[PDB]
Amino acid sequence: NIFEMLRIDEGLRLKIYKNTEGYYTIGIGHLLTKSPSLNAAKSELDKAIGRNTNGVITKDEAEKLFNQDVDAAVRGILRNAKLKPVYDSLDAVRRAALINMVFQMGETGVAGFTNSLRMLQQKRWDEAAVNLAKSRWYNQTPNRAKRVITTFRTGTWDAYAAARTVQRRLLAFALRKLIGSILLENVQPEDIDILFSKGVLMLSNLQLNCSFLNAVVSINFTKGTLRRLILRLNVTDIVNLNVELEVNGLSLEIELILDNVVEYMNKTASQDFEDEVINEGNLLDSILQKCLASTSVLMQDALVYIGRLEAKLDFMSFSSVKTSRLLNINGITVSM
Ligand SMILES: CCCCCCCC/C=C\CCCCCCCC(=O)OC[C@H](COP(=O)(O)OCCN)OC(=O)CCCCCCC/C=C\CCCCCCCC
């Protein structure tokens, strides 16, 4: 369906980001503001929820904002005079492509494509596709433009499936690099391939990379050992990403929030990922953000030392709830 398509095109991001046009945007392609002042952006989100945020949202809020943005899109199309005749005639797929464009560039601006809108009422797909290739929008999002145009041309979901495959490939690269970064163990592409072929990947007798932890948590970690690590991907629906990370037998030693993680990799891997992404034929930043945003975390039988005090944890979980994700912890006993 359409939400899948737009998820592919826009992706997901938890912090405030500059969209395809350069304007300030949040969530799954929700455009906050046309203004380029950062704090001037803070208005639409805060208004949407009703509480002071400093520019951050939750996943369900991004999904709600998604559904709502598509609803505003359909309001706009029916409101708009030149497009509604063009739209009323079309089938689900082409309708979806139109909705995508209107979603992307807004109600007001899209109605300027008179030549092509008319070209679409008459159902002249080919030369329409040639003409849309010669448009400011192709300049904005040439890849996306090519996909939407393809959708308009053939009338099926052929163009976006390839994008789905690409998403899988990139996500695999990102997960290999990330798990690689957390641990001292060598994670081959074959194991992540296992994580994608079968839903599960379990690594055992591992060891945390203390440099990673020191950089992310930021407070000195001495050593970290994890008995068992379980990763799971909603492979059946990779576009609506759901990640399941689980750590059993965590063993942290310490001597005396998420965004920085993204920063670290952004530094260290962006080049190599770029080297790979070009090889396959700042991109890694989006993938990682969607990944870490989609993940729900579990941990069992952890052991932490601080210094030295000892904290023993029976079970903990990190999931989304009704100003952020909730960290529920069970079975803490602290001793010497
Ligand atoms: C130790 C872990 C070892 C395993 C390492 C692999 C994990 C890393 C791989 C993926 C990580 C994915 C994490 C998902 C994001 C978590 C971010 C976070 O820390 O919470 C931030 C979140 C902000 O909202 P979000 O929308 O969830 O953030 C997303 C964008 N910032 O803020 C929170 O909810 C934090 C809640 C409090 C966290 C601090 C809790 C203190 C630590 C232990 C509890 C205290 C125990 C004390 C017992 C007594 C001891 C004497």
Swiss-Prot record:
Which residues does the annotated region (ER-targeting domain) include?
Answer: 164-178
Domain Chorein N-terminal stretches: 169-256
Q: Where in the cell is it found?
A: Preautophagosomal structure membrane; Endoplasmic reticulum membrane
- Say which species the protein is native to: Schizosaccharomyces pombe (strain 972 / ATCC 24843)
In the record, the note on similarity to other proteins reads: Belongs to the ATG2 family.
Q: What happens when the gene is disrupted?
A: Impairs atg8-processing.
**Entry domain remark:** The N-terminal region (NR) associates with the endoplasmic reticulum (ER) and is responsible for the formation of the isolation membrane at the PAS.
Name the record gives this protein: Autophagy-related protein 2
Report the protein's function.
Lipid transfer protein required for autophagosomes completion and peroxisome degradation. Tethers the edge of the isolation membrane (IM) to the endoplasmic reticulum (ER) and mediates direct lipid transfer from ER to IM for IM expansion. Atg2 binds to the ER exit site (ERES), which is the membrane source for autophagosome formation, using basic residues in its N-terminal region (NR) and to the expanding edge of the IM through its C-terminal region. The latter binding is assisted by an atg18-PtdIns3P interaction.
